[PDB]
PDB file of C-alpha atoms in Angstrom:
ATOM      1  CA  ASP A   1      -9.809  -2.620  -3.074  1.00 47.94           C
ATOM      2  CA  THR A   2     -12.497  -0.076  -3.985  1.00 48.21           C
ATOM      3  CA  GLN A   3     -13.676   0.461  -0.398  1.00 46.80           C
ATOM      4  CA  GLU A   4     -12.399   4.046  -0.307  1.00 47.58           C
ATOM      5  CA  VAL A   5     -13.839   4.911  -3.727  1.00 44.34           C
ATOM      6  CA  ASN A   6     -17.249   3.398  -2.965  1.00 41.54           C
ATOM      7  CA  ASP A   7     -17.375   5.043   0.466  1.00 42.77           C
ATOM      8  CA  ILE A   8     -16.418   8.451  -0.945  1.00 48.17           C
ATOM      9  CA  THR A   9     -18.975   8.042  -3.745  1.00 43.59           C
ATOM     10  CA  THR A  10     -21.731   7.127  -1.277  1.00 41.64           C
ATOM     11  CA  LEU A  11     -20.741  10.069   0.930  1.00 40.10           C
ATOM     12  CA  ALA A  12     -20.960  12.282  -2.168  1.00 38.83           C
ATOM     13  CA  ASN A  13     -24.338  10.816  -3.212  1.00 36.89           C
ATOM     14  CA  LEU A  14     -26.139  10.919   0.129  1.00 36.92           C
ATOM     15  CA  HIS A  15     -29.924  11.226  -0.073  1.00 35.67           C
ATOM     16  CA  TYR A  16     -32.397  11.272   2.821  1.00 35.28           C
ATOM     17  CA  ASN A  17     -36.062  12.289   2.902  1.00 35.26           C
ATOM     18  CA  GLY A  18     -37.313  10.437   5.999  1.00 33.11           C
ATOM     19  CA  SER A  19     -38.566   7.249   4.328  1.00 30.52           C
ATOM     20  CA  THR A  20     -35.890   5.194   6.145  1.00 30.80           C
ATOM     21  CA  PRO A  21     -34.986   5.277   9.863  1.00 29.58           C
ATOM     22  CA  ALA A  22     -32.938   8.358  10.699  1.00 30.65           C
ATOM     23  CA  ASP A  23     -30.889   6.272  13.138  1.00 30.61           C
ATOM     24  CA  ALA A  24     -29.883   3.893  10.335  1.00 29.63           C
ATOM     25  CA  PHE A  25     -28.974   6.819   8.062  1.00 32.20           C
ATOM     26  CA  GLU A  26     -26.875   8.323  10.867  1.00 32.28           C
ATOM     27  CA  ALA A  27     -25.146   5.017  11.607  1.00 30.74           C
ATOM     28  CA  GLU A  28     -24.365   4.214   7.970  1.00 28.63           C
ATOM     29  CA  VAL A  29     -22.984   7.699   7.257  1.00 31.14           C
ATOM     30  CA  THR A  30     -20.887   7.371  10.416  1.00 31.38           C
ATOM     31  CA  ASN A  31     -19.537   4.023   9.196  1.00 33.03           C
ATOM     32  CA  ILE A  32     -18.655   5.646   5.862  1.00 31.68           C
ATOM     33  CA  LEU A  33     -16.747   8.416   7.633  1.00 33.34           C
ATOM     34  CA  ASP A  34     -15.024   5.956   9.979  1.00 31.91           C
ATOM     35  CA  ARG A  35     -13.843   3.622   7.213  1.00 33.06           C
ATOM     36  CA  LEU A  36     -12.640   6.640   5.239  1.00 35.90           C
ATOM     37  CA  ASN A  37     -10.645   7.982   8.199  1.00 33.89           C
ATOM     38  CA  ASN A  38      -9.148   4.532   8.812  1.00 35.44           C
ATOM     39  CA  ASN A  39      -8.294   4.201   5.106  1.00 36.79           C
ATOM     40  CA  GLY A  40      -6.378   7.493   5.176  1.00 35.71           C
ATOM     41  CA  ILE A  41      -9.036   9.980   4.046  1.00 36.86           C
ATOM     42  CA  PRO A  42      -9.975  12.325   6.928  1.00 38.80           C
ATOM     43  CA  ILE A  43     -13.312  14.082   6.413  1.00 42.88           C
ATOM     44  CA  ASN A  44     -13.626  17.234   8.508  1.00 44.98           C
ATOM     45  CA  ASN A  45     -16.785  17.918  10.489  1.00 46.91           C
ATOM     46  CA  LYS A  46     -17.658  20.719   8.064  1.00 45.69           C
ATOM     47  CA  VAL A  47     -17.229  18.485   5.004  1.00 47.78           C
ATOM     48  CA  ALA A  48     -19.303  15.642   6.460  1.00 46.54           C
ATOM     49  CA  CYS A  49     -21.940  18.187   7.481  1.00 47.10           C
ATOM     50  CA  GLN A  50     -22.031  19.633   3.960  1.00 46.45           C
ATOM     51  CA  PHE A  51     -22.436  16.161   2.446  1.00 47.90           C
ATOM     52  CA  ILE A  52     -25.233  15.180   4.838  1.00 49.36           C
ATOM     53  CA  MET A  53     -27.072  18.453   4.232  1.00 50.69           C
ATOM     54  CA  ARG A  54     -26.776  18.031   0.471  1.00 51.93           C
ATOM     55  CA  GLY A  55     -28.392  14.638   1.053  1.00 51.97           C
ATOM     56  CA  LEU A  56     -31.387  15.883   3.063  1.00 52.16           C
ATOM     57  CA  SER A  57     -34.652  15.884   1.095  1.00 53.56           C
ATOM     58  CA  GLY A  58     -38.254  16.671   1.950  1.00 53.27           C
ATOM     59  CA  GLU A  59     -38.884  18.438   5.243  1.00 56.03           C
ATOM     60  CA  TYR A  60     -35.244  17.726   6.099  1.00 55.34           C
ATOM     61  CA  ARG A  61     -34.320  20.214   3.357  1.00 59.81           C
ATOM     62  CA  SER A  62     -35.293  22.816   5.960  1.00 57.33           C
ATOM     63  CA  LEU A  63     -32.097  21.908   7.831  1.00 55.14           C
ATOM     64  CA  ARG A  64     -30.136  23.101   4.781  1.00 52.97           C
ATOM     65  CA  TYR A  65     -31.094  26.644   5.822  1.00 52.66           C
ATOM     66  CA  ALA A  66     -28.489  26.278   8.592  1.00 53.40           C
ATOM     67  CA  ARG A  67     -25.884  25.304   5.965  1.00 54.80           C
ATOM     68  CA  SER A  68     -24.178  28.666   6.523  1.00 54.74           C
ATOM     69  CA  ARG A  69     -23.123  27.290   9.928  1.00 53.90           C
ATOM     70  CA  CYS A  70     -21.881  23.908   8.698  1.00 53.68           C
ATOM     71  CA  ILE A  71     -18.548  24.837  10.286  1.00 55.75           C
ATOM     72  CA  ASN A  72     -20.390  25.838  13.468  1.00 54.09           C
ATOM     73  CA  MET A  73     -22.583  22.725  13.294  1.00 55.12           C
ATOM     74  CA  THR A  74     -21.549  19.232  14.361  1.00 56.09           C
ATOM     75  CA  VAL A  75     -22.162  15.876  12.696  1.00 54.80           C
ATOM     76  CA  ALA A  76     -23.756  14.759  15.966  1.00 53.69           C
ATOM     77  CA  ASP A  77     -25.943  17.876  16.157  1.00 54.48           C
ATOM     78  CA  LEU A  78     -27.077  17.514  12.537  1.00 55.55           C
ATOM     79  CA  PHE A  79     -27.859  13.843  13.144  1.00 53.64           C
ATOM     80  CA  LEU A  80     -29.862  14.791  16.247  1.00 52.65           C
ATOM     81  CA  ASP A  81     -31.857  17.340  14.238  1.00 53.92           C
ATOM     82  CA  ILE A  82     -32.555  14.651  11.633  1.00 56.65           C
ATOM     83  CA  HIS A  83     -33.665  12.311  14.432  1.00 53.95           C
ATOM     84  CA  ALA A  84     -35.993  15.010  15.777  1.00 54.97           C
ATOM     85  CA  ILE A  85     -37.622  15.576  12.382  1.00 55.42           C
ATOM     86  CA  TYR A  86     -37.947  11.801  12.000  1.00 55.67           C
ATOM     87  CA  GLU A  87     -39.582  11.483  15.424  1.00 56.86           C
ATOM     88  CA  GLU A  88     -42.044  14.169  14.328  1.00 57.88           C
ATOM     89  CA  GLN A  89     -42.907  11.951  11.338  1.00 55.44           C
TER      90      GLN A  89
ATOM     91  CA  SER B   1     -14.960  28.565  -1.155  1.00 55.30           C
ATOM     92  CA  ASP B   2     -16.195  27.128   2.135  1.00 54.29           C
ATOM     93  CA  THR B   3     -17.533  24.091   0.231  1.00 51.34           C
ATOM     94  CA  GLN B   4     -14.467  23.777  -2.024  1.00 53.19           C
ATOM     95  CA  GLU B   5     -13.542  20.351  -0.627  1.00 55.44           C
ATOM     96  CA  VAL B   6     -17.047  18.966  -1.168  1.00 54.91           C
ATOM     97  CA  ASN B   7     -17.231  20.329  -4.722  1.00 52.97           C
ATOM     98  CA  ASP B   8     -13.807  18.892  -5.569  1.00 52.42           C
ATOM     99  CA  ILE B   9     -14.691  15.481  -4.117  1.00 52.84           C
ATOM    100  CA  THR B  10     -17.988  15.472  -6.024  1.00 52.43           C
ATOM    101  CA  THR B  11     -16.282  16.376  -9.302  1.00 53.74           C
ATOM    102  CA  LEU B  12     -13.641  13.694  -8.704  1.00 54.42           C
ATOM    103  CA  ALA B  13     -16.364  11.107  -8.051  1.00 55.65           C
ATOM    104  CA  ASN B  14     -18.325  11.962 -11.226  1.00 53.82           C
ATOM    105  CA  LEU B  15     -15.472  12.368 -13.704  1.00 50.73           C
ATOM    106  CA  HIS B  16     -16.382  11.758 -17.342  1.00 51.13           C
ATOM    107  CA  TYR B  17     -14.083  11.789 -20.379  1.00 52.31           C
ATOM    108  CA  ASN B  18     -14.685  10.383 -23.862  1.00 53.26           C
ATOM    109  CA  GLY B  19     -12.256  12.444 -25.963  1.00 51.77           C
ATOM    110  CA  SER B  20     -14.620  15.237 -27.025  1.00 48.15           C
ATOM    111  CA  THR B  21     -12.512  17.740 -25.039  1.00 45.89           C
ATOM    112  CA  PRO B  22      -8.715  18.178 -25.090  1.00 46.94           C
ATOM    113  CA  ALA B  23      -6.947  15.594 -22.948  1.00 43.59           C
ATOM    114  CA  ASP B  24      -4.666  18.313 -21.559  1.00 43.51           C
ATOM    115  CA  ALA B  25      -7.631  20.128 -20.004  1.00 43.80           C
ATOM    116  CA  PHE B  26      -8.923  16.858 -18.526  1.00 44.42           C
ATOM    117  CA  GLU B  27      -5.536  15.994 -17.015  1.00 45.34           C
ATOM    118  CA  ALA B  28      -5.320  19.540 -15.657  1.00 47.95           C
ATOM    119  CA  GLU B  29      -8.776  19.349 -14.072  1.00 45.16           C
ATOM    120  CA  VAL B  30      -8.068  15.994 -12.412  1.00 41.63           C
ATOM    121  CA  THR B  31      -4.687  17.220 -11.159  1.00 41.00           C
ATOM    122  CA  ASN B  32      -6.172  20.457  -9.806  1.00 37.80           C
ATOM    123  CA  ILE B  33      -8.872  18.497  -7.969  1.00 39.47           C
ATOM    124  CA  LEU B  34      -6.330  16.111  -6.443  1.00 41.24           C
ATOM    125  CA  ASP B  35      -3.954  18.931  -5.489  1.00 40.37           C
ATOM    126  CA  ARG B  36      -6.633  21.073  -3.837  1.00 43.96           C
ATOM    127  CA  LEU B  37      -7.906  18.023  -1.953  1.00 40.89           C
ATOM    128  CA  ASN B  38      -4.429  17.104  -0.697  1.00 40.12           C
ATOM    129  CA  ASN B  39      -3.770  20.728   0.283  1.00 42.98           C
ATOM    130  CA  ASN B  40      -7.088  20.810   2.178  1.00 40.16           C
ATOM    131  CA  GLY B  41      -6.276  17.601   4.071  1.00 40.27           C
ATOM    132  CA  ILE B  42      -7.844  14.864   1.920  1.00 40.15           C
ATOM    133  CA  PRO B  43      -5.093  12.652   0.421  1.00 38.45           C
ATOM    134  CA  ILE B  44      -6.127  10.597  -2.620  1.00 38.85           C
ATOM    135  CA  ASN B  45      -3.858   7.597  -3.209  1.00 38.98           C
ATOM    136  CA  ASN B  46      -2.561   6.704  -6.661  1.00 42.20           C
ATOM    137  CA  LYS B  47      -4.832   3.645  -6.730  1.00 41.90           C
ATOM    138  CA  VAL B  48      -7.868   5.681  -5.669  1.00 40.10           C
ATOM    139  CA  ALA B  49      -7.135   8.444  -8.186  1.00 40.69           C
ATOM    140  CA  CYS B  50      -6.666   5.803 -10.896  1.00 39.16           C
ATOM    141  CA  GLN B  51      -9.990   4.165 -10.023  1.00 40.85           C
ATOM    142  CA  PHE B  52     -11.768   7.532 -10.103  1.00 39.52           C
ATOM    143  CA  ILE B  53     -10.256   8.580 -13.438  1.00 39.42           C
ATOM    144  CA  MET B  54     -10.982   5.190 -15.017  1.00 38.55           C
ATOM    145  CA  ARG B  55     -14.603   5.102 -13.843  1.00 37.10           C
ATOM    146  CA  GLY B  56     -15.016   8.316 -15.855  1.00 34.40           C
ATOM    147  CA  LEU B  57     -13.492   7.060 -19.106  1.00 33.81           C
ATOM    148  CA  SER B  58     -16.064   6.736 -21.899  1.00 36.38           C
ATOM    149  CA  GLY B  59     -15.980   5.803 -25.568  1.00 35.77           C
ATOM    150  CA  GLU B  60     -12.806   4.212 -26.896  1.00 34.46           C
ATOM    151  CA  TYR B  61     -11.148   5.253 -23.625  1.00 35.68           C
ATOM    152  CA  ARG B  62     -13.295   2.574 -21.960  1.00 34.59           C
ATOM    153  CA  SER B  63     -10.604   0.211 -23.264  1.00 33.83           C
ATOM    154  CA  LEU B  64      -8.259   1.760 -20.692  1.00 33.26           C
ATOM    155  CA  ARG B  65     -10.525   0.417 -17.935  1.00 31.50           C
ATOM    156  CA  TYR B  66      -9.099  -3.027 -18.765  1.00 30.22           C
ATOM    157  CA  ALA B  67      -5.907  -1.931 -16.983  1.00 29.86           C
ATOM    158  CA  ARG B  68      -7.995  -1.491 -13.809  1.00 27.77           C
ATOM    159  CA  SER B  69      -6.374  -4.648 -12.423  1.00 28.63           C
ATOM    160  CA  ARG B  70      -3.201  -2.561 -11.974  1.00 29.09           C
ATOM    161  CA  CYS B  71      -4.434   0.367  -9.878  1.00 30.19           C
ATOM    162  CA  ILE B  72      -1.709   0.274  -7.224  1.00 29.71           C
ATOM    163  CA  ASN B  73       0.709  -1.004  -9.889  1.00 33.39           C
ATOM    164  CA  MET B  74       0.109   2.109 -12.026  1.00 34.27           C
ATOM    165  CA  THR B  75       0.559   5.832 -11.419  1.00 31.28           C
ATOM    166  CA  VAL B  76      -1.862   8.591 -12.397  1.00 34.17           C
ATOM    167  CA  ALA B  77       0.784   9.710 -14.900  1.00 33.67           C
ATOM    168  CA  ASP B  78       0.697   6.412 -16.823  1.00 34.39           C
ATOM    169  CA  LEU B  79      -3.093   6.551 -17.145  1.00 33.10           C
ATOM    170  CA  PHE B  80      -2.799  10.132 -18.386  1.00 33.76           C
ATOM    171  CA  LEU B  81      -0.226   9.028 -20.975  1.00 34.56           C
ATOM    172  CA  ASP B  82      -2.609   6.322 -22.184  1.00 35.19           C
ATOM    173  CA  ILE B  83      -5.460   8.841 -22.460  1.00 40.69           C
ATOM    174  CA  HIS B  84      -3.189  11.251 -24.344  1.00 41.20           C
ATOM    175  CA  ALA B  85      -2.129   8.467 -26.711  1.00 41.44           C
ATOM    176  CA  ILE B  86      -5.741   7.646 -27.567  1.00 41.47           C
ATOM    177  CA  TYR B  87      -6.513  11.356 -27.966  1.00 38.50           C
ATOM    178  CA  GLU B  88      -3.533  12.050 -30.241  1.00 37.27           C
ATOM    179  CA  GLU B  89      -4.504   9.027 -32.330  1.00 39.50           C
ATOM    180  CA  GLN B  90      -7.969  10.581 -32.672  1.00 41.26           C
TER     181      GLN B  90
END
């Protein structure tokens, strides 16, 4: 009953600093976006990008410098950058 | 401006009302958030909007959360009337 509200809240309160696997973070955010699109709440690529960048902490905060191109960025590309920084760790 | 949708969704997720501000301004802020989100392509159902507004109710207005069983059964307008009733009584 609250699946949409909890998913939107978790999308709004994303937080990543590299202490957990970047692949798991990517997959769980993708599940949030997928359940929200199936429940009637479409999240554009720019909006999902903005949320994920607001959630990046630590070295990943560096990625926020590209936040001007959140429209030009892709959720997949941002997730790949996160995976690269995580592989460097 | 570019992040307007994210800011509106964040404000909708962290609503907070306890009666210290006018209920008209609170209703207006919730309605503006919902309207901008629907105009930008993010439709918030009546049940979802009710759940969001009720999660924010504090103080005596916490009593209103007891009607949370009727989220689909209740419109945003009815919740706003309840909030206005408690505020006018205060």
